[PDB]
Design a protein around this ligand. Sequence first.
Ligand SMILES: O=C(NCCc1cccs1)c1ccncc1
Lengths: 300, 237
Amino acid sequence: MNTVPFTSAPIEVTIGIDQYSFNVKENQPFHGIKDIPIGHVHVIHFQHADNSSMRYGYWFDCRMGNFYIQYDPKDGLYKMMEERDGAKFENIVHNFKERQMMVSYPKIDEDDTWYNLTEFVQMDKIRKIVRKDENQFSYVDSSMTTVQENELSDPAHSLNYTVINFKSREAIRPGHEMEDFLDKSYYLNTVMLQGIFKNSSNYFGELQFAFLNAMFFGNYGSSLQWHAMIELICSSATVPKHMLDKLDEILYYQIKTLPEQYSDILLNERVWNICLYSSFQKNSLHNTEKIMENKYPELL
Amino acid sequence: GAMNSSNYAELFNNDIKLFVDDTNVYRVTVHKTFEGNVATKAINGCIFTLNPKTGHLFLKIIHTSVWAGQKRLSQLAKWKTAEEVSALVRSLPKEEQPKQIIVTRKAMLDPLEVHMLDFPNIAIRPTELRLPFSAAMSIDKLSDVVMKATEPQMVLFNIYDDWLDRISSYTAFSRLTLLLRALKTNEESAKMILLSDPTITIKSYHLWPSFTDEQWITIESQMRDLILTEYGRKYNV
Ligand SMILES: O=C(NCCc1cccs1)c1ccncc1
């Protein structure tokens, strides 16, 4: 029911909306995307036809405001903007809908894929990871580094994922060196869950957001974050049963959605082999182990 | 990164460094039980922690009591090694703390890094060098203090005796590695070469005999020949 209108499409571009994508031609009569499901975050993403280095996009929630896209010929990109005049915005969307210049968000009724990928992802959590507090939407692109990548440049244009480091004083209690290094339960349960995330929902939200940034933008730091958050759980002997059952469902949908042709660059052979076959939780991820063995037996 | 043949003079520069060898920490005799099963009996071990510049050997004796009621002892031995090295560093005045600790086995890297997180300026390094420090327990006086220990104990030795009065650290380390390689390849033969002449003794405060410069050259020759003799006997060459 919500709509993201476009002023125009002056440059040939592949447009993504969540897990869907379509090609728009230079100056093609295209005025945006309609029938976007209320109740979920969304991502609208771009890859220019003349330059695939330009891979970028915007996380938004249509409940938070009226958003549109307009090409900036100076900065050379499709920009998200907020329209504060509700009546004007409603008038514009009505004209473009009447003239059928919009594509429809192509959701299959049976289809829970996007819910399954975004169940724990909240727009207010995204805005803490991606800091630009004058906008209600968050810009991400393929080259953005993480706070962790920037400790091993520009702080303003970075992904503020929670730093996970297995060989850090945060991860290891004095006098518990071997225990804490070989069993990450302390680091998962006391430091991260009780200490930083407050609950498993916030932890899963960041994990899911990292995956999606890895997949949709080929963001390398995001892929590192997604794997560190899986490995921290799989390397913990003591994990609530409900968290393991949920993690299995989360990973299942992520592996199901991943394009086959990106499996080699988006999946870390060492982490997945350790998680499924050597870790404390090697027998706890039934759905994920089955889809990984049937879809990516070469990686394993 | 990794200590190799290309960066070997670095051992003898004025940056304090220690080698740590964990080979002799967890030691067992394997035997048959009454029911014809197999069981282990632990015997006393040692951490071999050596300053290659000074010859200072911090020999921490590992008494069999530290294994009582513990599981996965080969894994625990690496962490106990890292614990005791960490404890040793913390015991030294700041100006005596090493800048680098080189482990002889790559399995010691994560245990030692984790125990030394408090010391971010101490580099924990592997080595490509195949060092024969396992043969420490072939030095009679080191073997004796380990096997007699009834409790955890640190014993301090100079593994170079008084050699540094007459030779450089580079030469002393070369002599030590040749003696230990020989003791590792054929202990009986190596020991005969060192001890066959009763007129050359071991001073009470030394590990090795009191060889003159000329006599060290003969000894060094006999050791290189033993290592080739045994390499021939081994490969049928
Ligand atoms: O084909 C049309 N819809 C654009 C949606 C799309 C944008 C780019 C590819 S299909 C169109 C043509 C004529 N009258 C109204 C609408």
